[model samples]
Target: KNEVVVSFENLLTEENSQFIADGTPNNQAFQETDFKDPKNLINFNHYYADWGSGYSFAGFSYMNITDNQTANSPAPITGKAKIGSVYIGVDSTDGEYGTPAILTILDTNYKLKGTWIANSTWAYMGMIQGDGYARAFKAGDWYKVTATGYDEAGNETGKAEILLANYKTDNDLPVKEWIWFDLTPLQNAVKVKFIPDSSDKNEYGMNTASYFCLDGITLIEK
Candidate 1:
């Protein structure tokens, strides 16, 4: 089987080291664009909106910054030029059934081989220490990321998920290392949506920051 790995090292250079899809300097709030890999393997659906003081973004951005020291921000916990996204419901247009973050495969000939998944600084720290919006995770609390797959006919294929933070005890910690999240169960998925959830939730939504990092996306040809 032919395999294609969508890596982002080429986007990292001394001239333009990192890229953020919606992190503009001023309040202009420009239109966000989908992130397309050079190999045409997949396209990440980006959603952006002007929220008066701050803009909201729910999509992928490539970056080489590996500053794990920063607890709450856009940078990934590790690796160079990994794919990252900050998921939110403000940009979803599917009413009650829309996902905050999404990605679509260009074709249906490839089987999902899986990818390296990790937590962003914002989400990881939000689980450890309570942010202004998110509650500090306690014993038995957990945070998970679910990948829901859909076929070309719009039929749901399957779902794959991983826990980024699992606090069974007070001494337990969130995921600090890169973990391989298998997606083979998705089979020939044409589109995939990322759904982040936590034990903490309210009328507004989930308390945890819905952010995740991805790298080494391997897709195998059927």
Candidate 2:
């Protein structure tokens, strides 16, 4: 008989917390907030800290999880914030970084798919580095997937390319709306990454500048 390892469902209950651990550095702040409802999605107020010489930086607006230096930045989605409609900051001032959320695998051979919604008020999202870093899928830059992995020493080991559902032209989702992404093909990927294009390092948008939101992340099995 075959043994089952892990499985993920639609709702993000406490039970699933073991499957997808929060990557947010300061997740404790919004631990009491409920993510299931759009009205009570995680919200991190804006705070400023001087970087240097009259230059100050801000913390992440909502819940952001990445390997970047600035873990806390402000939300760019204006007033109301929701799970599938929270803005993220992508900056170039720091080293090339990727935000990753851990997800427990139910079966190693299963396929995953869900909706991914994004809008480029300024930049696009995509996979960076050769491989061995993270699987990056950008928003507003045409849906696509890039397989990646790292060796024991944290070096690029392998990579693959795949096409994503063309929802950009057809749906034309609003800037602050939620979308789905089918991640079945990327099941082999160990780490998943979401990145925004570099905006000429001008700090035009959020501190990270390029802003985008993600929601309805699902995993399917066959």
Candidate 3:
């Protein structure tokens, strides 16, 4: 029953202001409308890349899931957390971070590979020089998703790498809508490392904007 669907909406806490931060310390203008929500739902920023290897820091501004965040299609399973909204945010191709962008999953393939929007973003600026700094990414401007499976003692169980998405062809299509990526191919594991890569490389490292969304995360089960 631990069907691991990770809806970010659950992040809302009675603790208040835990998730909102419009960049100011104690910046309390934190409400749903700040993200342009017509209703009172919430959204949060999301981004990460191992320009050195990293963690996410949206800095207080996210889009509340709407009919917008709901997948244009169907979910792979009956979700566990149908809590209402998806967390939306942009990517940063900035050359300052390292790996483990989001959650370092102690979660996994009980019935895994949830759904999300690998849509567009405005995180790159390239200093207004554009690209590698802030470029609008599309299915064409994409990356590959790979996974490394591990066992209890942190030994290898499986290592599978595949294309996360690409707009290079018609059928392959870009990952603009909600989609499922089953992790069984990565084998029975204690943990997994998920990485999204691109053709954009530089002296520093991957220059691709690391932006995307996650929901119905399909957590781990014992």
Worst-scoring 10-residue span by lDDT in model 2? 27-36
Error of 1 at 125 (Å): 1.2
Best by TM-score: 1
In the range 1-222, model 3's lDDT, one tens digit per residue, is 455454445455442112343443323221121232222222223322123322224322233423322322112112211335434343333235443322224333352343343433221221112353443344355456565666657787776655534545433434444555566665556555555566555587655444444444454453
lDDT of 1 by residue, 25-143 (tens): 44454355777777777887765555675544555666555565666565555533334422111122222634356678885578778887777777777877878898788899887
Global fold similarity of model 2 (TM-score): 0.35
Q: Which residues of candidate 1, in runs, are more than 4 Å off?
A: 14-32, 49-56, 79-99
Candidate 3: segments with Cα more than 4 A from true spot: 1-4, 13-83, 88-97, 102-117, 123-141, 161-165, 169-173, 219-222
What is the C-alpha lDDT profile of model 2 across 36-150, one tens digit per residue?
2232222222222333432222222223322222222222232222243233332212233323222223233433344343432222222221122222223442333343433
lDDT of candidate model 2 versus the reference: 0.31
Candidate 2 vs candidate 3: which has greater TM-score?
3
* Residue 89 displacement (Å), model 1: 16
Ranking by TM-score: 1, 3, 2
Model 1 error, position 15 (Å):
7.4
lDDT by candidate, in order shown: 0.68, 0.31, 0.40
Better by TM-score, candidate 2 or 1: 1
User: How much is 60 displaced in model 3, in angstroms?
Assistant: 14
Off by over 4 Å in 2: 1-111, 120-176, 198-208
